[PDB]
Structure formats: C-alpha cells, structure tokens
Amino acid sequence: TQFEERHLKFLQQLGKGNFGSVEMCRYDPLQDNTGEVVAVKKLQTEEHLRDFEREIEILKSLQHDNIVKYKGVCYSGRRNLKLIMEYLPYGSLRDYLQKHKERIDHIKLLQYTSQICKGMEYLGTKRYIHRDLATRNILVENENRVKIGDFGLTKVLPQDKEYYKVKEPGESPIFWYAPESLTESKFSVASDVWSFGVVLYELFTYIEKSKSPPAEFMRMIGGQSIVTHLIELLKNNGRLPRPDGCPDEIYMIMTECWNNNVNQRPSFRDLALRVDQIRDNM
Amino acid sequence: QFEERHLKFLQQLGKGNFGSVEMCRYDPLQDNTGEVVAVKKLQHSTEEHLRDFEREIEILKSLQHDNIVKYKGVCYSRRNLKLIMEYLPYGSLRDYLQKHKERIDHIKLLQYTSQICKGMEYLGTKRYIHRDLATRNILVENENRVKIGDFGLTKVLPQDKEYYKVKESPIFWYAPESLTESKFSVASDVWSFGVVLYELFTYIEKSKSPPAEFMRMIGGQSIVTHLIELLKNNGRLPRPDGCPDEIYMIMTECWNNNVNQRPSFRDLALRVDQIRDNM
Ligand SMILES: Cc1cc(Nc2ncc(C)c(N3CC(CC#N)(N4CCN(C)CC4)C3)n2)sn1
Numbered sequence: 208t209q210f211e212e213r214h215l216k217f218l219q220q221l222g223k224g225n226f227g228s229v230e231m232c233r234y235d236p237l238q239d240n241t242g243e244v245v246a247v248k249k250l251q252t253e254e255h256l257r258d259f260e261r262e263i264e265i266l267k268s269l270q271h272d273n274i275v276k277y278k279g280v281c282y283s284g285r286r287n288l289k290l291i292m293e294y295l296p297y298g299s300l301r302d303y304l305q306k307h308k309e310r311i312d313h314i315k316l317l318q319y320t321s322q323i324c325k326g327m328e329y330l331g332t333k334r335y336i337h338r339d340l341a342t343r344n345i346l347v348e349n350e351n352r353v354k355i356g357d358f359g360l361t362k363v364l365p366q367d368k369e370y371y372k373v374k375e376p377g378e379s380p381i382f383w384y385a386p387e388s389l390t391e392s393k394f395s396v397a398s399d400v401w402s403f404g405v406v407l408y409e410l411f412t413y414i415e416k417s418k419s420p421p422a423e424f425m426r427m428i429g430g431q432s433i434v435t436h437l438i439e440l441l442k443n444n445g446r447l448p449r450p451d452g453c454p455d456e457i458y459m460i461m462t463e464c465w466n467n468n469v470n471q472r473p474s475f476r477d478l479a480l481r482v483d484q485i486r487d488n489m
Numbered sequence: 490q491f492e493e494r495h496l497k498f499l500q501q502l503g504k505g506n507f508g509s510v511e512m513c514r515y516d517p518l519q520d521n522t523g524e525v526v527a528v529k530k531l532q533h534s535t536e537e538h539l540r541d542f543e544r545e546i547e548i549l550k551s552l553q554h555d556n557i558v559k560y561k562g563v564c565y566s567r568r569n570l571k572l573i574m575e576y577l578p579y580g581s582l583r584d585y586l587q588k589h590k591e592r593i594d595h596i597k598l599l600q601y602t603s604q605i606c607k608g609m610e611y612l613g614t615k616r617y618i619h620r621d622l623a624t625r626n627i628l629v630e631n632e633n634r635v636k637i638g639d640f641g642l643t644k645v646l647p648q649d650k651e652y653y654k655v656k657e658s659p660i661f662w663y664a665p666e667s668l669t670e671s672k673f674s675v676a677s678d679v680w681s682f683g684v685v686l687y688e689l690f691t692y693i694e695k696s697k698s699p700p701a702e703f704m705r706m707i708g709g710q711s712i713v714t715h716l717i718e719l720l721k722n723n724g725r726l727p728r729p730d731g732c733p734d735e736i737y738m739i740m741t742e743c744w745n746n747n748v749n750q751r752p753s754f755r756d757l758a759l760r761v762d763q764i765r766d767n768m
C-alpha cells in the first residue's frame with residue numbers, strides 16, 4: 208500500500224531517540240479527518256540512512272501477533288524517508304505498566320512475558336538479533352496483547368556464524384547488555400535472552416525508578432568507566448536482586464538468563480513453556 | 490518466679506516512650522548455660538503505668554496459643570516489675586521481612602497472615618482489643634511460624650459494650666472511629682490488620698510505607714485532621730505492586746468506613762488460607 212506525504216497529517220510526537228523520532232499521524236487521502244491513525248518513524252547521515260533501510264526491510268519481513276505491523280514507506284526521497292506502522296494506542300509496556308500497575312497482577316505480567324518470548328522466538332527463526340529488548344521497546348495493543356515495537360538496533364546473523372559483532376560508537380543500554388556484549392560487542396540469541404531476563408526484572412519491579420536496572424547496578428558499583436565497573440560486577444556474579452514478591456520459578460528464570468556462559472542460557476521456546484506453566488499453576 | 494540477681498542483660502531489643510524489651514539469660518548456675526528470655530520493663534514506673542503493666546501481665550498470662558508470644562513469668566524486686574517472655578531469635582516480622590524479603594514469596598506472606606488472623610481470632614474469644622496490630626508487634630519464631638509479640642496497648646472490652654473508648658498513637662494504622670472518637674473494637678483491630686496485610690505485600694519498603702503514602706495523599710491543621718478528611722473522602726492505601734486481586738479486595742474490606750461491614754478474623758483466616766491453597 209502506497210503512502211503520499213501530502214496525506215500524512217502530523218498529530219503528536221510519541222517518542223524521540225538519539226537518532227530517531229516516532230509520530231502519531233492520520234493518513235487522510237479524503238482530508239475529512241476519517242483517515243487511519245498510524246505511527247511514523249523517521250531520522251533526526253548516510254550511515255544511519257543505510258541502517259534505517261535495513262530496519263525497514265527487517266520489519267517488512269516480519270508477520271506475527273507479537274510484532275508491530277509494517278504498513279509501508281512514505282518518501283518526499285531519502286532525507287524524508289518514513290517507516291509507517293500500526294498505531295497502538297496504549298503505547299510502551301514501560302508507560303502502560305507505570306500508569307496501570309494497580310490493575311495488573313502477576314498473571315497479567317506472565318501473559319505479556321509469554322507473548323514477548325513468542326515474538327522473540329519468531330525473530331530467532333529469521334536469525335534476527337534484537338539487541339534492544341526492554342519494556343520501552345514493547346507496545347500494548349490491548350489489555351491482553353503486547354508486541355515488540357521497535358527494530359532500531361536489530362541485526363541479521365551472518366550465514367555461517369551464531370553472533371554479530373557490532374562496531375558502533377553510539378550510546379548503548381548497558382544495564383540490559385550481556386557481559387560478552389559489553390566486553391567484545393558480541394550479540395546473539397543468548398544476549399537477547401540475557402536482555403529478556405532484565406525485561407522480566409522490569410515487569411516484576413513494576414518499573415519503580417528506585418528498583419530500575421540503572422538504579423540497582425549503580426548501587427552495587429558504589430577511577431574507571433561505569434562500563435568497566437559493570438563488567439567487573441557481572442564477572443564477580445553481581446546480579447539484580449529478586450523483585451519483591453517475584454515467584455521462585457520466575458526469579459530462577461531471571462538468574463538462568465543471566466548465566467555468564469552464553470551456552471547455558473535458556474531458549475525462547477523453553478522460556479515461553481516455563482512462563483506459561485508458572486502462569487497455569489497460579 | 491524470676492530473681493533479678495540471675496537475670497543477666499545481653500542486648501537491648503527495642504525501646505518505647507514508657508517501656509523497653511531486653512534479651513536476657515536466666516542463669517541461676519551463673520555458668521552462662523541459663524535459657525535466653527525476653528524481659529519487658531517500664532522506662533518510667535509511675536503508679537498508673539505500674540497498674541497498667543500489671544493488667545498487661547494478666548492479659549498475656551491468660552493467652553496460651555501457637556501464635557501468641559509465650560508468657561514465662563514475672564520479676565518482683567514491685568517498683569522494678571519485669572515481664573518475662575520467650576525470646577524469639579528472628580525478631581519482629583518487620584525486621585525479618587526487611588532483611589529476608591529476597592527469600593520470602595507470596596505463599597510465605599499468606600502463611601504469616603493466616604497465623605496473625607488465628608492469634609487475633611483467639612484474642613477475640615477473650616474480648617481483648619489489641620489496638621497496636623503492626624508487623625513491628627509480630628515476632629518470627631522460625632521460617633514457618635510468627636506470633637503476636639506485644640500487648641502494651643491491649644484492652645479488655647467492658648461487660649456491656651463491644652468497644653473500649655481510650656481517653657503519640659500509630660495514626661496511619663488507626664480506623665477512622667479510633668482517630669475521631671478513640672473507639673477501639675475488634676473492627677478497629679480488623680482495620681489495623683488490613684494495614685498489616687499492606688505492610689507485608691509492600692515488603693516493608695520505606696517508599697511504600699503507610700506514613701509515606703498517606704502523607705503523599707495529604708501534601709494550617711494537624712496531620713490527624715487531614716487523615717480524618719482523607720479517610721472520610723474514601724482516600725485509601727494503593728494496591729501493592731503484584732498484590733493478588735483477592736488480597737487487595739480483603740485489604741479494601743478491612744478499610745470499610747462502616748465498623749459493621751468489616752470482615753471477622755474467622756472469615757479473614759478462611760479467605761487467606763484459600764487464596765494460599767489456590768496458589
Ligand atoms: C501514547 C503512546 C502510544 C504509542 N504508540 C505507538 N504505536 C506504534 C509505535 C511504532 C510506537 N513507538 C514508540 C516506539 C517504542 C516502541 N515500541 N518508539 C521507538 C523509537 N524511540 C525513539 C521512541 C519510542 C515505537 N508507539 S507510543 N505512546
């Protein structure tokens with residue numbers, strides 16, 4: 208489906224990053240305010256533009272209940288290139304949980320967790336490494352469905368290798384990053400699983416700022432970079448604490464996702480089953 | 490009977506305005522082999538406080554139950570009157586939960602909640618109003634048992650009334666009618682138990698404490714005046730993060746403005762047992 212810029216009407220800024228922005232837009236070829244509300248991603252260089260084109264190919268290739276729906280592209284055009292997606296009105300799982308936590312029980316968190324795993328399992332089947340797995344990059348469609356909503360750092364594994372080594376000088380979500388992603392820049396399914404452990408931690412802490420990954424890691428750390436301190440803390444088996452009231456089996460899952468050894472981390476297929484089972488037992 | 494000369498001070502456990510509890514060895518062989526006990530005494534021994542303490546001692550002596558700290562005896566030496574109790578080594582549920590939260594699940598909280606209800610149900614049968622139900626006044630015997638550990642404010646209901654009118658107070662634990670009229674009842678005990686439940690499911694987090702939350706809702710008049718207005722306007726403590734639906738619902742029913750619409754301790758015990766069984 209083709210989108211003409213002249214019919215793309217700006218409603219509201221949803222989120223701004225270092226290198227991106229997402230906007231709420233109405234696509235209104237009848238210019239009568241009846242056009243479909245959509246989400247529009249665009250840049251704020253030629254490197255970032257090569258990467259964005261890759262990001263667009265990646266999401267176009269994905270069709271799944273738990274991945275934000277690709278709708279199309281909108282060109283003036285490369286400087287003005289926009290990626291058009293469905294608009295999910297409840298926004299990020301991060302803001303939704305912050306807003307609505309007093310109505311979200313353990314059962315509901317486990318439903319969301321399971322859908323994250325299935326979205327991530329499907330990414331696995333394409334050999335795509337997300338590298339940014341966090342509740343801020345998960346959208347709420349409704350009370351009963353979440354989707355992975357951003358692929359801004361996602362990479363394709365080389366054909367004959369199980370990891371992608373990234374050489375980028377930009378800021379990184381280090382408190383979500385596996386030891387081997389920090390030390391060697393190696394991203395894999397296993398570094399995705401590490402990141403998922405912290406998503407689990409995010410959900411069961413109900414994203415309270417006092418218990419956030421940055422807050423907890425900085426408390427354990429106490430003349431070297433924060434990155435050096437984090438690496439040394441993780442090497443020494445420093446880990447995020449058990450969230451208050453987190454069930455035994457969900458903490459055990461967190462702890463296994465945060466194995467120093469890449470090869471000893473659970474699969475997304477195994478994680479989905481264990482989470483479904485913990486949920487069934489409640 | 491306990492002789493002061495054999496009561497050997499080990500450590501201060503806690504202090505209030507008018508009394509103190511100490512860890513002591515009772516050692517009549519003075520060889521360091523005597524049994525460790527808990528010893529309560531008055532900070533100021535006025536005649537009135539001493540009459541009250543004698544009442545407090547009779548109250549605990551009358552209580553024989555798995556979920557009430559064991560009375561062991563008294564120390565005369567009358568000005569220097571001491572109450573001797575068992576020493577529970579894990580201390581208050583408040584300090585235990587603060588320390589050990591990372592090893593305590595919802596199932597364990599519900600076990601403790603159930604045992605508090607049974608201790609409170611039994612107080613019921615004697616017509617005793619506790620008036621100080623809080624995790625700081627619950628002791629941990631071991632991983633699998635808690636007890637009500639203090640009866641410093643407890644009253645006996647008059648013969649012909651279902652309430653006692655008592656003319657600093659733990660106001661953030663106090664039922665509206667305790668704040669406005671000083672009326673204590675089993676229903677004000679239930680109100681207070683709601684806040685104990687709230688304490689447990691917030692894992693004694695300072696950021697989520699009753700004082701912290703109530704003062705956040707409030708913001709030239711007393712905190713007590715603002716609290717009464719907030720409670721009359723149906724202001725209430727929020728649902729603790731991940732508190733199960735049925736445990737929040739129980740909290741909310743304990744905090745009914747109407748005394749007569751609060752659950753019984755017998756009903757609370759059954760509902761909490763059942764929520765625990767269903768998990
Ligand atoms: C109020 C509200 C609703 C939102 N709905 C929405 N519907 C679709 C997408 C694609 C989307 N977004 C925000 C997103 C995060 C995710 N997933 N961006 C990524 C880029 N970041 C720089 C900012 C956040 C993609 N939001 S958002 N809020």
Ligand SMILES: Cc1cc(Nc2ncc(C)c(N3CC(CC#N)(N4CCN(C)CC4)C3)n2)sn1
Pocket residue numbers: 502503504505508509510527558574575576577578579580581625626627628637638639641
């Ligand atoms: C670490 C530890 C061990 C303790 N064990 C204990 N064993 C018996 C009693 C009676 C007791 N205590 C302290 C208590 C708290 C309650 N319930 N008092 C209530 C009166 N408050 C003014 C001060 C604290 C009764 N503690 S205590 N700590």
